Amino acid sequence: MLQPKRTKFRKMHKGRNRGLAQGTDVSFGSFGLKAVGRGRLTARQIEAARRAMTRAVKRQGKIWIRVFPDKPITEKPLAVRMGKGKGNVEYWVALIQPGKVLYEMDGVPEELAREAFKLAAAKLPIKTTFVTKTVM
Amino acid sequence: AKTIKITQTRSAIGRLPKHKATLLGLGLRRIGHTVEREDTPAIRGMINAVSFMVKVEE
Amino acid sequence: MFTINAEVRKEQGKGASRRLRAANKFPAIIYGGKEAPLAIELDHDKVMNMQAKAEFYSEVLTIVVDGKEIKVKAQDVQRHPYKPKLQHIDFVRA
Amino acid sequence: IVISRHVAIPDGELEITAIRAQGAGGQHVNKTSTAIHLRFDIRASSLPEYYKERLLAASHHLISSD
Amino acid sequence: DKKSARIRRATRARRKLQELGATRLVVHRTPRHIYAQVIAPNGSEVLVAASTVEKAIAEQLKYTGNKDAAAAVGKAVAERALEKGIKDVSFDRSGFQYHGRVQALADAAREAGLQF
Amino acid sequence: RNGRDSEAKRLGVKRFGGESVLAGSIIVRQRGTKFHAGANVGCGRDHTLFAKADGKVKFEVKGPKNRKFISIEAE
RNA sequence: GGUUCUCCCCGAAAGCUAUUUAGGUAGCGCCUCGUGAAUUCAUCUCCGGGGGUAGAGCACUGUUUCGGCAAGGGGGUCAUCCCGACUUACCAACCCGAUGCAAACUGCGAAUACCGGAGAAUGUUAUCACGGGAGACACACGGCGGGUGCUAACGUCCGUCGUGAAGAGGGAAACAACCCAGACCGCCAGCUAAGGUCCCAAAGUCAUGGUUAAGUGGGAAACGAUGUGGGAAGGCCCAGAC
RNA sequence: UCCUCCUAAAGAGUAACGGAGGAGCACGAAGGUUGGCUAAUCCUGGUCGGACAUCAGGAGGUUAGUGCAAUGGCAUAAGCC
RNA sequence: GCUCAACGGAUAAAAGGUACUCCGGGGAUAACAGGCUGAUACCGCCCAAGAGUUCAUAUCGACGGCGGUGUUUGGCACCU
RNA sequence: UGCCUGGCGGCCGUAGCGCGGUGGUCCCACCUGACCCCAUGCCGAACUCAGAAGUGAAACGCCGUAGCGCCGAUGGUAGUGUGGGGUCUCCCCAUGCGAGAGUAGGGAACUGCCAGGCAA
Fold it and tell me: Which keywords describe this protein according to UniProt (chain E)?
């Protein structure tokens, strides 16, 4: 479970996921998996994606993860009167602005990479596209 | 600053406090009401304030 | 080398830009030396096919504007977030 | 999951039904006091040979002949 | 170094005296030489000045840089101040510790009738 | 285990650059030292800025560190 | 719980503070009547201002991925007791470099809003003060900015505005709180607003060029698909391709 | 009950059984004034001392300190003597 | 000279039970049902390694994702 | 007027550092001594006094240098006041305002008051 160690506050405000992403290009890898929609990405959904995706490359090349949850979602226990403080920390999730580059890879065949990311999209709750690290 | 014709084209019910205060500043009371003033940037600003609901003729 | 028949921008601004960006065209800019920077307007589609080559950011390009062909160079580019499109391209007069 | 010491025992083999209780206590206890669970863990599924054998051959209630 | 050190000490009273609209009495001491002058409440221009660079007192003294040297020119600067009739004077320790020549300097000024 | 806010101590500035005031007129109620008396202004014990002389307020900022000052243009 | 004739004029609030106070009450804000004092006050333009939120950013507070350097340390060669030395199936952070994030982070920094001043037009003098009488101190909803909740609720809690509250009429089939628009009265008069114009039912079976075959329109997504239309480029192409 | 920050939407102000911490003192000096001074943290050398004792140089630059929580602030020091 | 800390402090001084309870009120506020919602529950679907004789698409199908119903417990208190 | 030196203001990070060069008839710094004024919670370091042979290295100032710090267009982009609309957990249209970052380039200053040295 990708999770923030040594944090300052335990719970934070929900905020709004407006605006557009900053990490628009593929820095590390040669190809990227840039997202289309606007949504949330839990730590579990990252594991479902990456682990299932790394099997496609078959232990070849390196996978660069360009995201981190760093935001705790608190939910109330079942059968609880509405009110009386915020709920307990349930998990972690990252806020993704459209056009965000999520994964990077290199030392991998184009079509294998094209297919590996296809499998990754299945576990991801956000629409995405296959992009490559373009020159300049 | 010659004469300038200003007319009201919409209501003042669902309007902003500033807009309401501005509309009475122009003197326009009822809808379709006409009025005459002197063309100056001060008035032009007010004209620009409620342009969405005002028909202006020179 | 790549000849670009671009038009001088009539008006700059946020509204005008998106207005012509909907018209399959997008704005650009040029500068370099003591000369005055000029607001350049051109197509996006065909130019999109031009920048597909890596040599597009190394070649001393030639943008012809109403007879006046300027030898320019591609400094930097501003793209669209997710859709494979362009926003604006910086052109250094070379 | 209804987690057992080693084998997790994933829910789907443990049928959970909500019925009404039995007793006294007013309006709540006679009608709406549901969630009175009736578990049903068949040994035909998981709970490996060592577990299920002592739950099918053993003489005890809360566990049936099947 | 030494300069900046003396500056951080001087700025203290100088700011206070800058906002009081009075003629501040600034002095500048060196091992062999001494300077003295008054400043207008504005801090832009000066009114009078006297130092060891002036022949009028340099010839009269034995050595430029000792107690008596400041005592002589101290009277000199106070006299042209007396010539200008200016009395609203406020002394400035100017970072220099008040005990050496600067001490003897203020005396001749005070003997002339300077209000401070 | 929470919800124990103290009070809104009515901080902030009172006057602005371009307003004529009288002697004793408080300019700003700053807690720290976000400003400093340039001239004709007094820095209270709470480092609050009050006008010692009548006139108009003018905001300035000087020095390499550039800490904002306040003086009074005699009026 | 109830509180009986008539007409004319104006016209609230459901907030703040304290309360053995929380369906009460008191002061204040907001209503009204009379009076006294100012181009007083309101809208716009220009001028002089402070703010740091949005956004952005990552030097500081924390947090994030990876790599070059590289030593602290360790499995070993063994010091077969303490010194010494290499290596490093490694953590690879710290220095150096590249990359994201933050209500309680800020080397930056809007739009609005707010204060003061100058000037013109306009407004029933709408500002302020004094005095008489108040009611009210349970608010709802829509939009926008947010807390909480499941970015659930005709949920709840604040800021701000509108509406209802205390406003009918037209439209949304029906529909306080949505869109339009403020009922002094009469008229078998005309023009329009939102919204609509085959019939029920008043108004174009209007005009022009495209699009869909599903009654789509007329409940709904991830995802799948030789459904089809428009657009650019390219592979290839009568030395003959599918 | 009171104090700090956030929530708070860049004036003030603004709720929640909303999100995190504190106070019910201390001081005759830790106050006033006059004078002087002003770091933290790394690199290195050195007796027991080896990662830190303390001293000495350079770098560095205010992350120091400020009776106590936080916030704003302070070297012209409100910091230290 | 009173942690008059329930801190604008009802008197120096003041704890509980009522299922025989009584009265005045309230859906301004609970229990049942109805309503809104759909966390939970149930139902369907996308993806898929492995088990499965071969083979994931014979069958299950975890890890995760997207919807539907309103029969589960709930949330909310709009009706009484 | 200038090369200047010294004291005092205004414009401010373009106004501050790094590297090399460069100045002393004057001035300044260093430098000499200190029973005695004065000084060290020890020490003439600092401070003060009495003088000043020597030096121009350190220090200070000037010149070149952007090598940096740093400043910073133009355009675009984000956001947003107002009026509408939408597939209204967010965006779009008309309209006005308009960042931060980043790019080109630039950027190591300018000016004033008083007192003397130097050649007129």
Answer: Phosphoprotein, Ribonucleoprotein, Ribosomal protein, RNA-binding, rRNA-binding
- Which residue in A102, A128, A131, A136 has the most chain C C-beta atoms within 10 A of its own C-beta, making it the best mutation to test that interface? A136
Find the residue in A nearest to C77 (Cα). A136
Contact E25, E13 (CB under 8 A): no
The three-point CA angle A81-A86-A90 to 5° equals 100
| Other residues' Cβ atoms within 10 Å of the Cβ of residue D24 | 7
> Are A136 and C77 inside 8 Å of each other by CB?
yes
Q: Residue D44 and residue A56: Cα distance in Å, rounded?
A: 36
- In this complex, the residue of A34, A135, A136 whose CB is nearest that of residue C82 is A34
A29-A30-A32 Cα angle (round to 5):
75
Q: Specify the number of domains making up chain A.
A: 1
Q: Both ends of chain E: CA-CA distance in Å?
A: 32
Experimental method: cryo-EM
User: What would the two tokens of residue A11 be?
Assistant: 């719970």
Nearest-by-CA chain C residue for A20? C81
Strand H nucleotides, any atom under 7 Å to a protein CB: 1-8, 11-22, 35-38, 71-78
- Resolution in units of Å: 3.7
CATH number of C1-94: 2.40.240.10
CATH of E1-116, one of 2.60.40.3500, 3.40.720.10, 3.30.420.100, 3.40.50.620: 3.30.420.100
d(C-alpha C72, C-alpha E110), whole Å? 78
Nearest to C82 among A129, A135, A136 (CB): A129
d(CA A23, CA A102): 9
B1-58 fold: Ribosomal Protein L30; Chain: A, (3.30.1390)
Q: What are the residues whose beta carbons fall under 8 Å from the beta carbon of A72, sequence distance 6 or more?
A: A10, A11, A12, A89, A90, A91, A92
Integer Cα distance of A21 and A18 in angstroms: 9
| Structure-block tokens of residue A55 | 């099997």
Domain boundaries, chain E: 1-116
Distance separating alpha carbons of residues F53 and F23, to the nearest angstrom: 5
All residues at 6 or more sequence positions from A13 whose CB lies less than 8 Å from its CB, including other chains:
none
